[PDB]
GROMACS .gro file of C-alpha atoms in nm:
model
  181
    1UNK     CA    1   8.931  11.485   6.193
    2UNK     CA    2   8.916  11.299   6.525
    3UNK     CA    3   9.026  11.496   6.830
    4UNK     CA    4   9.330  11.312   6.968
    5UNK     CA    5   9.570  11.371   7.258
    6UNK     CA    6   9.911  11.397   7.091
    7UNK     CA    7  10.213  11.336   7.312
    8UNK     CA    8  10.482  11.602   7.275
    9UNK     CA    9  10.773  11.383   7.391
   10UNK     CA   10  11.043  11.640   7.473
   11UNK     CA   11  10.799  11.863   7.664
   12UNK     CA   12  10.610  11.609   7.873
   13UNK     CA   13  10.258  11.724   7.789
   14UNK     CA   14   9.983  11.615   7.550
   15UNK     CA   15   9.858  11.853   7.279
   16UNK     CA   16   9.482  11.843   7.213
   17UNK     CA   17   9.365  12.054   6.922
   18UNK     CA   18   9.567  12.265   6.680
   19UNK     CA   19   9.879  12.387   6.857
   20UNK     CA   20   9.845  12.747   6.738
   21UNK     CA   21   9.487  12.788   6.863
   22UNK     CA   22   9.493  12.567   7.175
   23UNK     CA   23   9.775  12.693   7.396
   24UNK     CA   24   9.656  12.676   7.760
   25UNK     CA   25   9.783  12.422   8.012
   26UNK     CA   26   9.551  12.181   8.193
   27UNK     CA   27   9.596  11.891   8.436
   28UNK     CA   28   9.383  11.575   8.418
   29UNK     CA   29   9.417  11.354   8.726
   30UNK     CA   30   9.291  11.023   8.861
   31UNK     CA   31   9.302  10.944   9.234
   32UNK     CA   32   9.238  10.600   9.380
   33UNK     CA   33   9.132  10.678   9.736
   34UNK     CA   34   9.011  10.361   9.916
   35UNK     CA   35   8.848  10.023   9.858
   36UNK     CA   36   8.632   9.770  10.035
   37UNK     CA   37   8.498   9.417   9.989
   38UNK     CA   38   8.780   9.333   9.746
   39UNK     CA   39   8.804   8.978   9.883
   40UNK     CA   40   8.493   8.888   9.682
   41UNK     CA   41   8.714   8.908   9.371
   42UNK     CA   42   8.943   8.625   9.487
   43UNK     CA   43   8.781   8.278   9.475
   44UNK     CA   44   9.008   8.116   9.734
   45UNK     CA   45   9.083   8.235  10.086
   46UNK     CA   46   9.420   8.061  10.054
   47UNK     CA   47   9.536   8.300   9.781
   48UNK     CA   48   9.498   8.588  10.028
   49UNK     CA   49   9.737   8.405  10.263
   50UNK     CA   50  10.014   8.365  10.004
   51UNK     CA   51  10.270   8.645   9.987
   52UNK     CA   52  10.265   8.633   9.606
   53UNK     CA   53   9.937   8.806   9.677
   54UNK     CA   54  10.054   9.156   9.587
   55UNK     CA   55   9.776   9.373   9.445
   56UNK     CA   56   9.773   9.703   9.259
   57UNK     CA   57   9.554   9.913   9.033
   58UNK     CA   58   9.614   9.961   8.661
   59UNK     CA   59   9.461  10.201   8.412
   60UNK     CA   60   9.543  10.370   8.084
   61UNK     CA   61   9.514  10.750   8.103
   62UNK     CA   62   9.528  10.906   7.755
   63UNK     CA   63   9.749  10.621   7.638
   64UNK     CA   64   9.975  10.622   7.945
   65UNK     CA   65  10.000  10.295   8.138
   66UNK     CA   66   9.964  10.369   8.510
   67UNK     CA   67  10.012  10.129   8.799
   68UNK     CA   68   9.958  10.207   9.165
   69UNK     CA   69  10.166  10.117   9.470
   70UNK     CA   70  10.136   9.744   9.547
   71UNK     CA   71   9.953   9.633   9.862
   72UNK     CA   72   9.904   9.299  10.036
   73UNK     CA   73   9.599   9.340  10.262
   74UNK     CA   74   9.313   9.268  10.024
   75UNK     CA   75   9.061   9.195  10.301
   76UNK     CA   76   9.146   9.520  10.484
   77UNK     CA   77   9.301   9.749  10.221
   78UNK     CA   78   9.592   9.957  10.341
   79UNK     CA   79   9.709  10.134  10.026
   80UNK     CA   80   9.743  10.511  10.050
   81UNK     CA   81   9.539  10.746   9.830
   82UNK     CA   82   9.737  10.785   9.511
   83UNK     CA   83   9.704  11.030   9.222
   84UNK     CA   84   9.835  11.013   8.867
   85UNK     CA   85   9.818  11.327   8.651
   86UNK     CA   86   9.891  11.422   8.290
   87UNK     CA   87   9.949  11.769   8.149
   88UNK     CA   88   9.743  11.879   7.849
   89UNK     CA   89   9.799  12.180   7.624
   90UNK     CA   90   9.465  12.269   7.466
   91UNK     CA   91   9.177  12.513   7.487
   92UNK     CA   92   8.882  12.492   7.725
   93UNK     CA   93   8.633  12.415   7.450
   94UNK     CA   94   8.847  12.168   7.257
   95UNK     CA   95   8.956  11.974   7.565
   96UNK     CA   96   8.603  11.961   7.705
   97UNK     CA   97   8.479  11.829   7.370
   98UNK     CA   98   8.767  11.580   7.355
   99UNK     CA   99   8.692  11.441   7.701
  100UNK     CA  100   8.319  11.425   7.627
  101UNK     CA  101   8.411  11.193   7.337
  102UNK     CA  102   8.644  10.960   7.526
  103UNK     CA  103   8.552  10.606   7.629
  104UNK     CA  104   8.537  10.543   7.999
  105UNK     CA  105   8.853  10.491   8.198
  106UNK     CA  106   8.881  10.123   8.295
  107UNK     CA  107   9.054  10.079   8.631
  108UNK     CA  108   9.163   9.722   8.703
  109UNK     CA  109   9.246   9.554   9.030
  110UNK     CA  110   9.540   9.331   8.942
  111UNK     CA  111   9.754   9.057   9.092
  112UNK     CA  112  10.064   8.981   8.888
  113UNK     CA  113   9.954   8.962   8.526
  114UNK     CA  114   9.586   8.896   8.605
  115UNK     CA  115   9.295   9.136   8.625
  116UNK     CA  116   9.067   9.040   8.912
  117UNK     CA  117   8.808   9.301   8.826
  118UNK     CA  118   8.756   9.640   8.669
  119UNK     CA  119   8.531   9.941   8.690
  120UNK     CA  120   8.426  10.204   8.436
  121UNK     CA  121   8.493  10.569   8.524
  122UNK     CA  122   8.331  10.813   8.284
  123UNK     CA  123   8.546  11.090   8.145
  124UNK     CA  124   8.245  11.232   7.961
  125UNK     CA  125   8.074  11.276   8.299
  126UNK     CA  126   8.371  11.489   8.405
  127UNK     CA  127   8.360  11.692   8.084
  128UNK     CA  128   7.989  11.754   8.144
  129UNK     CA  129   8.059  11.932   8.474
  130UNK     CA  130   8.375  12.114   8.355
  131UNK     CA  131   8.181  12.437   8.322
  132UNK     CA  132   8.387  12.693   8.519
  133UNK     CA  133   8.746  12.600   8.436
  134UNK     CA  134   8.871  12.958   8.444
  135UNK     CA  135   8.792  12.967   8.817
  136UNK     CA  136   8.772  12.617   8.963
  137UNK     CA  137   8.872  12.257   8.916
  138UNK     CA  138   8.600  12.012   8.812
  139UNK     CA  139   8.585  11.675   8.990
  140UNK     CA  140   8.378  11.358   8.972
  141UNK     CA  141   8.421  11.157   9.291
  142UNK     CA  142   8.232  10.836   9.355
  143UNK     CA  143   8.241  10.482   9.488
  144UNK     CA  144   8.269  10.264   9.179
  145UNK     CA  145   8.183   9.892   9.172
  146UNK     CA  146   8.451   9.649   9.055
  147UNK     CA  147   8.318   9.372   8.829
  148UNK     CA  148   8.498   9.037   8.788
  149UNK     CA  149   8.561   8.918   8.431
  150UNK     CA  150   8.361   8.596   8.486
  151UNK     CA  151   8.025   8.528   8.323
  152UNK     CA  152   7.855   8.405   8.642
  153UNK     CA  153   7.890   8.565   8.985
  154UNK     CA  154   7.814   8.330   9.272
  155UNK     CA  155   7.727   8.461   9.619
  156UNK     CA  156   7.727   8.233   9.923
  157UNK     CA  157   7.557   8.304  10.156
  158UNK     CA  158   7.299   8.507   9.962
  159UNK     CA  159   7.179   8.799  10.176
  160UNK     CA  160   6.908   9.063  10.125
  161UNK     CA  161   7.181   9.322  10.081
  162UNK     CA  162   7.481   9.281   9.855
  163UNK     CA  163   7.791   9.474   9.965
  164UNK     CA  164   8.007   9.458   9.652
  165UNK     CA  165   8.373   9.537   9.579
  166UNK     CA  166   8.404   9.913   9.569
  167UNK     CA  167   8.683  10.154   9.471
  168UNK     CA  168   8.673  10.521   9.563
  169UNK     CA  169   8.795  10.725   9.263
  170UNK     CA  170   8.818  11.097   9.195
  171UNK     CA  171   8.882  11.228   8.844
  172UNK     CA  172   8.963  11.598   8.814
  173UNK     CA  173   9.022  11.847   8.534
  174UNK     CA  174   9.166  12.192   8.602
  175UNK     CA  175   9.362  12.470   8.441
  176UNK     CA  176   9.721  12.424   8.546
  177UNK     CA  177   9.723  12.766   8.716
  178UNK     CA  178   9.400  12.691   8.908
  179UNK     CA  179   9.489  12.518   9.234
  180UNK     CA  180   9.303  12.202   9.328
  181UNK     CA  181   9.232  12.348   9.676
   0.00000   0.00000   0.00000
């Protein structure tokens, strides 16, 4: 059968693997830390000037819809670093295998009901380095490039270098009793 993260509603954790064999608590977390060059994802300077310009990040973490704190300053981002975490009851081996099999997390920069761009954050990459979970948290931290949903990207003026929209993300897996530090 397919390894699936099964919400236990009353308890507020997700069971991964058979509940009698997979009984340890883990925390899986996503942190959006900073961003730059986001203005490339908005075609019109005038949209930045409107106050309806309220931007936030969205992603689905094991089937949970997560939105971040809205911010207005797209050209000079001022959102605070923000973490969302889920609790998982599983075993080391089963959870590591489960994460290695998950599709990438897709984090979207949104305005209202529109996605302006998204980036792929590998959970399998995190599983691959989750090799000492009895003793330490495992973290993948990187600057991820946001891609607009359009077919053609136009750049004016075209320069030799290409500073692109970037989102700093950290994804972490740890045993619940192992402090992040």
